[PDB]
Design a binder for this molecule. Structure first.
Ligand SMILES: Cc1cc2c(cc1C)N(C[C@H](O)[C@H](O)[C@H](O)COP(=O)(O)OP(=O)(O)OC[C@H]1O[C@@H](n3cnc4c(N)ncnc43)[C@H](O)[C@@H]1O)c1[nH]c(=O)[nH]c(=O)c1N2
Ligand SMILES: Cc1cc2c(cc1C)N(C[C@H](O)[C@H](O)[C@H](O)COP(=O)(O)OP(=O)(O)OC[C@H]1O[C@@H](n3cnc4c(N)ncnc43)[C@H](O)[C@@H]1O)c1[nH]c(=O)[nH]c(=O)c1N2
Ligand SMILES: [Cl-]
Ligand SMILES: [Cl-]
Ligand SMILES: [Cl-]
Ligand SMILES: [Cl-]
Ligand SMILES: [Mg+2]
Ligand SMILES: [Mg+2]
Ligand SMILES: [Mg+2]
Lengths: 413, 413
């Protein structure tokens, strides 16, 4: 098993690296092998058909052409149709959400001096700690309570998420979803690189790598235990920092002066025999609540879902572990209390799907190149986490641009 | 959470343990939790639809009512219909297969004095080493070449496998398969155990266990990374010796005076537009050949498959890893040579499925109890590998019987 070029990771980053390399005249005649530990490409892009009826996004779900121009361009390039993503305003504005908008405006002159303190400590200047907790909780993203998220970071974060962007008057961002699922873009890239001669080995997990003369020897394991050795001349690891850390490549110290973190994410989707929420004018609305569901979305008349992070993602995953019936009963209870509705008036679902992402969002904990190189071995690393767009598909696209240029440089050396 | 009784492993052994325990009046009122690292029960019983048409067995495939009475009784108990397994004679015997029958008969008076030497060394007494290799290879089970398989053991092995049992005049054994797949029996046991109150947590891998007072604390990991702790008062590990060795319970030293081994297995199934093998009168026949396919089976007019162990299982898994196209081409090459027909006359398949089992058969290497106990902790271990029926579902049923009695004794103490 040998190749000129090897890419480990068949998410949007790795597949886009492959696209850029195969487009280069400098890679004519070179063989390209792509590994992924999963049996399908896409990584944290994961589209499914809910009850075989509606397409849902278990992973990445939305993008903005204003914020994410490379993604918009890729959707157009592969003829993937977009649709409006409807969850961009908060119709049922609560007092504490209105208050946070006022507080963030009133406090903004203090960002120059005090903007490096935590968002929680900063917002506490408005009316005290307790009022700040109530206000921040109403944004629905529990990461905003982290001590390491500064006020200046949080102001940026709030303005780039569609549900809460009005809180910093960032309403000019439009938000789109995929008409057929972002998996269609993944499959478009995969089919393009395969037509250009890439060979795919899905279901193989890279365990270790070592330099082999001017190349590398990779040790992988199939998901049935089969041990595989692969030799390559040039290597991109298009996997996130948590995955790099599981390898034997001295990540992160040999690659940058930075530390990386991650947070868990959870999504749950439910579909019902009737669109019972139409009676309450909830179609295409999102509710943000002081309640373990946190963010509750009603998609037209098709389905509902909720989206949580950090401790509440872990709460829902623990519930799942205790059993399906208790999990569905807990959703029913929290929906009733969020909607001010009789628990009996919330029906039971016909079908549901959920997904827990242990490292759903990854990020640098601290300047930083968009792709990295191992100081000794020349292996290249590619991930949204190395960019200003960490946690967005746009970031993978940007990292892929840099990673492909670094690999071309090595090839031409 | 917690349980009175916990079983790790939901193959036929673990499920049968649960059934026996839940049938006991001594377990009234007790809670029972069952973990398995896979998302479905069954273990090495794995039934699948080939091209959605016919049911095939990627794992265990046949049993004999004469050799395996508890399995026949379980099929009847759960109303699972059996059908004749056709591959019980060699219609197209080679000369070397005929010669091995003569050799084993002519040498049998030497078994008393010399039966503990290797099968290879013993058969070499007939016409020398080279003739013995030719004869033994023609049985199609490469394990027969191991130095640790004695002549006494091999005579027993040959007489209990359907394709070659005529070599030792064991034609009285009938052989059956499941009309709908042995997965139906697994699901029967599962439904019975679930009705009786057992709770299933599938997709959780046991990582480690330690004693905790009068019970145990289990560390498990979901296949999405979720880490889970479980407390129980009584524990059966219904997993094979290879899986025991991966835990932290000092297997095998703390459990038995014996050592355990394993061999890989591989099955490949192919379906075609036409039953082309009918022209050679091969329907419902098996050929055993000196080529990597080893044992080639033609099932009516429905499909063909091959079944290999040891180095040839690894040969095929390596082929799979190099690519689907090269794997199918290799099958076509070896099929042509085995049938003595030209390669072009072998059509290309419509659909195919395969399965590599890294530890497909597990066995004791060396008066062995049918279930084991940890000398200190009281944990119980259950597996076909601890019985005189290692490698057969019957052995799981026998080990389950003993392991359930060992647990009831612990409960009633
Ligand atoms: C719940 C949720 C919600 C969102 C998002 C994610 C999640 C989980 N995101 C972020 C988006 O999903 C993310 O930025 C990109 O998909 C990451 O692409 P990569 O290819 O860099 O990594 P990604 O993690 O997708 O791919 C890495 C690949 O490497 C493989 N791998 C890892 N280790 C390996 C090994 N050792 N051997 C072999 N293979 C290995 C993995 O199997 C995986 O396929 C998002 N973005 C956005 O734009 N809009 C949004 O709405 C959201 N929302
Ligand atoms: C290719 C092939 C062909 C045959 C056979 C097997 C194979 C692979 N067999 C043998 C038969 O399949 C075997 O004897 C029984 O299925 C074994 O049943 P057990 O429940 O003991 O183990 P089995 O291995 O089935 O179950 C063990 C369970 O433990 C789980 N597990 C392991 N470690 C774990 C951990 N750490 N945490 C959680 N879960 C864990 C596994 O996922 C699995 O579900 C057979 N027999 C026969 O009668 N007739 C035949 O024709 C053949 N032929
Ligand atoms: Cl795919
Ligand atoms: Cl993740
Ligand atoms: Cl012959
Ligand atoms: Cl196995
Ligand atoms: Mg990738
Ligand atoms: Mg079992
Ligand atoms: Mg004989």
């Amino acid at each position: 098993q040998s190749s000129d070029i090897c890419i480990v990771g068949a998410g949007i980053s790795g597949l886009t690296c492959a696209s850029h390399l195969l487009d280069s005249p400098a890679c004519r005649g070179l063989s390209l092998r792509i590994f992924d530990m999963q049996q399908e490409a896409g990584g944290r892009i994961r589209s499914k058909m809910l009850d075989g009826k509606a397409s849902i996004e278990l992973g990445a779900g939305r993008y903005s052409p204003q914020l994410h121009p490379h993604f918009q361009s890729a959707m157009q390039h592969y003829s993937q149709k977009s649709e409006v993503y409807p969850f961009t305003q908060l119709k049922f504005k609560s007092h504490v959400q209105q208050k946070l908008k006022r507080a963030m405006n009133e406090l903004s002159p203090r960002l120059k001096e005090h903007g490096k303190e935590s968002f929680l400590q900063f917002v506490s200047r408005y009316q005290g700690h307790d009022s700040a907790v109530g206000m921040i909780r109403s944004m629905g993203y529990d990461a905003l309570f982290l001590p390491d998220i500064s006020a200046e970071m949080a102001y940026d974060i709030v303005g780039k998420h569609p549900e809460i962007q009005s809180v910093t008057d960032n309403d000019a961002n439009q938000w789109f979803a995929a008409e057929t699922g972002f998996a269609g873009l993944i499959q478009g890239i995969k089919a393009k690189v395969k037509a250009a001669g890439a060979r795919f080995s899905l279901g193989y997990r890279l365990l270790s790598v070592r330099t082999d003369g001017d190349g590398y020897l990779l040790q992988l394991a199939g998901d049935d235990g089969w041990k595989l050795e692969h030799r390559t001349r040039h290597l991109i690891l298009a996997i996130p920092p948590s995955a790099m850390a599981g390898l034997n490549v001295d990540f992160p110290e040999a690659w940058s002066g930075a530390r990386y973190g991650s947070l868990p994410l959870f999504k749950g989707f439910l579909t019902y025999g009737e669109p019972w929420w139409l009676d309450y004018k909830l179609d295409d609305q999102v509710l943000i609540v002081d309640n373990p569901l946190r963010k509750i979305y009603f998609k037209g008349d098709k389905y509902l879902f909720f989206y949580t992070d950090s401790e509440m993602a872990n709460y829902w995953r623990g519930c799942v572990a205790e059993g399906e019936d208790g999990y569905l009963e807990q959703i029913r209870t929290h929906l009733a209390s969020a909607l001010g509705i009789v628990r009996e008036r919330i029906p039971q679902p016909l079908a549901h799907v959920h997904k827990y992402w242990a490292h759903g969002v990854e990020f640098c904990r601290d300047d930083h190149p968009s792709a990295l190189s191992h100081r000794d071995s020349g292996i290249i690393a590619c991930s949204d986490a190395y960019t200003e767009h960490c946690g967005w598909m746009e970031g993978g696209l940007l990292s892929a641009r840099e990673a492909s240029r670094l690999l071309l440089q090595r090839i031409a050396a």
